[PDB]
Amino acid sequence: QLTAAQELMIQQLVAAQLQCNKRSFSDQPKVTPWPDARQQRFAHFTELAIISVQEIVDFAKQVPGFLQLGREDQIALLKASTIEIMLLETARRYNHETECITFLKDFTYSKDDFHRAGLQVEFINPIFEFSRAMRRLGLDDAEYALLIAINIFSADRPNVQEPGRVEALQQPYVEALLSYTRIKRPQDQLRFPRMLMKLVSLRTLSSVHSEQVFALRLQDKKLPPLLSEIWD
Amino acid sequence: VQLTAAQELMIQQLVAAQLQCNKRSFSDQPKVTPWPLGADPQSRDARQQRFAHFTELAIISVQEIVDFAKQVPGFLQLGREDQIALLKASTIEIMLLETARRYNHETECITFLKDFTYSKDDFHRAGLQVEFINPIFEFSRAMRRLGLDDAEYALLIAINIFSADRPNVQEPGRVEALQQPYVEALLSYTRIKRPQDQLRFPRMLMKLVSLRTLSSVHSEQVFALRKLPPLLSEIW
Ligand SMILES: CC(C)(O)c1cn(-c2ccc(-c3cccc(S(C)(=O)=O)c3)cc2)c(C(C)(C)c2ccccc2Cl)n1
Ligand SMILES: CC(C)(O)c1cn(-c2ccc(-c3cccc(S(C)(=O)=O)c3)cc2)c(C(C)(C)c2ccccc2Cl)n1
């Protein structure tokens, strides 16, 4: 059974996830409308990424223990995980019946909509493959929030000054996930390792993204200062 | 809490295959270019000999990796194209895992084959990069603190071979299916090895995560090359 201390920690994760998502709903009319059609779509996805960076920063701040790390390590952790949390979050917002992704909470996008924005098949295909594989695991809101916390507290990230402290903070989240999964599916048991293995997939996805970041140097419109920095 | 007969025989099979692979490679010990000793410490010929020797040790590793894989239950069940795709993508991760297994924390030296022993500086003196030499040593030190045995390494290697997400895999569903008995067997083995820990298993599995980043950084593209970011600092 789950420990009361573990439940508290999870309750805080789910509340922060719900608060940050809700905070971004009001941005729906503020984003450039979906239809040069290609450029407008590219600028639309760009604005959506900017908002996602905000939610991630805002959520991480609410993760128990994140605020006790040094300021330099906090930023270093957030720099390397932003792409991976965006991917994790994309998967949570993926519907396999319609085969579509819900951004904000009304805005629906299909595989072809990303292709029509000038994004390469080299990157869009793995995104949808990852979303489908995540869907089969049947994660709930708590399981994603836990997985995102584990991802944030990665000690091997570049420019991390106190990796021992980062690693020690990841421990309760892995523990809570182990406990949470054992109660939800007592007869599976392979489900928990299958979740952790998705963190391995995320490493490759981030690496594929860094190679696809090259294709963006070709189009005349440059990425906003924020996005251009986090990704290159 | 005891291993199943299917688990015990597989682990034995895996450790047996791991042994005969290393065994066969020791025959090549006098065949490879000798490690230069007594030369001028600034010698070009010596640095080129050191380099050609490490190149040869890597060539032996590859053949050993292929021989071991062919003996992993289910690997030969896959199509030849997936077998190649899986081995192309995992070779470097297996080399690194195998290096950590051969690392000694008392001497701080790595044993290639079973006689040759090299320190951090020995890799530097062969002109190997050091962007990559330091990460090799720190991965080896991290793996030592997990205190893995030969069974746990063979199991982690099998789990690594069967990754559905590798480039050019045509049947990822089957690859992912074949990974499961090795994940199961590792869970049971760690459960019996350290019944009070329970975190040792997820920590082990987590080393595949950092291992995936180590591999990407070794083969990173010149067009994809990557202080505090000012804009992200402003958002806090
Ligand atoms: C290169 C370019 C145009 O600037 C760009 C931006 N994005 C993008 C990145 C992240 C997101 C996103 C992820 C999670 C949630 C949200 S949201 C709108 O707060 O619900 C948006 C949306 C789009 C993306 C794509 C679509 C490729 C992407 C989607 C999912 C995850 C990562 C990336 Cl890079 N490309
Ligand atoms: C490209 C270059 C310069 O020829 C090269 C080769 N290697 C290398 C690769 C693999 C190995 C190796 C790993 C495990 C076992 C063995 S063995 C069969 O016991 O000699 C060799 C040794 C050296 C390496 C280094 C030393 C950097 C390396 C070490 C460990 C893992 C990978 C690599 Cl690339 N660089």
Swiss-Prot record, chain A:
Which cellular compartments is it found in?
Nucleus
Q: Which domain of life is it from?
A: Eukaryota
Kindly provide the PTM information from the record. Answer: Sumoylated by SUMO2 at Lys-184 and Lys-222 during the hepatic acute phase response, leading to promote interaction with GPS2 and prevent N-Cor corepressor complex dissociation.
| Any single Gene Ontology cellular-component annotation | nucleoplasm
Give the span(s) annotated as Transactivation AF-2. Answer: 2-232
Gene Ontology BP annotations = cell differentiation; cholesterol homeostasis; hormone-mediated signaling pathway; intracellular receptor signaling pathway; mRNA transcription by RNA polymerase II; negative regulation of cholesterol storage; negative regulation of cold-induced thermogenesis; negative regulation of DNA-templated transcription
The location annotated for the cross-link Glycyl lysine isopeptide (Lys-Gly) (interchain with G-Cter in SUMO2) is K184, K222
What is this protein's tissue specificity according to the annotation? Ubiquitous.
Reply yes or no: does the keyword Electron transport apply: no
- GO MF term set: apolipoprotein A-I receptor binding; ATPase binding; chromatin DNA binding; DNA binding; DNA-binding transcription activator activity, RNA polymerase II-specific; DNA-binding transcription factor activity, RNA polymerase II-specific; nuclear receptor activity; nuclear retinoid X receptor binding
Show where the NR LBD domain sits: 5-232
Which keywords does this Swiss-Prot/TrEMBL entry list? Activator, DNA-binding, Isopeptide bond, Metal-binding, Nucleus, Receptor, Transcription, Transcription regulation, Ubl conjugation, Zinc, Zinc-finger
Subunit structure, briefly? Forms a heterodimer with RXR. Interacts with CCAR2 (via N-terminus) in a ligand-independent manner. Interacts (when sumoylated) with GPS2; interaction with GPS2 onto hepatic acute phase protein promoters prevents N-Cor corepressor complex dissociation. Interacts with ABCA12 and ABCA1; this interaction is required for ABCA1 localization to the cell surface and is necessary for its normal activity and stability.
Entry's family note: Belongs to the nuclear hormone receptor family. NR1 subfamily.
Q: What does this protein do?
A: Nuclear receptor that exhibits a ligand-dependent transcriptional activation activity. Binds preferentially to double-stranded oligonucleotide direct repeats having the consensus half-site sequence 5'-AGGTCA-3' and 4-nt spacing (DR-4). Regulates cholesterol uptake through MYLIP-dependent ubiquitination of LDLR, VLDLR and LRP8; DLDLR and LRP8. Interplays functionally with RORA for the regulation of genes involved in liver metabolism. Induces LPCAT3-dependent phospholipid remodeling in endoplasmic reticulum (ER) membranes of hepatocytes, driving SREBF1 processing and lipogenesis.
What is the protein name given in its UniProt record? Oxysterols receptor LXR-beta
Q: Which organism is it from?
A: Homo sapiens (Human)
- Lineage in the entry? Eukaryota, Metazoa, Chordata, Craniata, Vertebrata
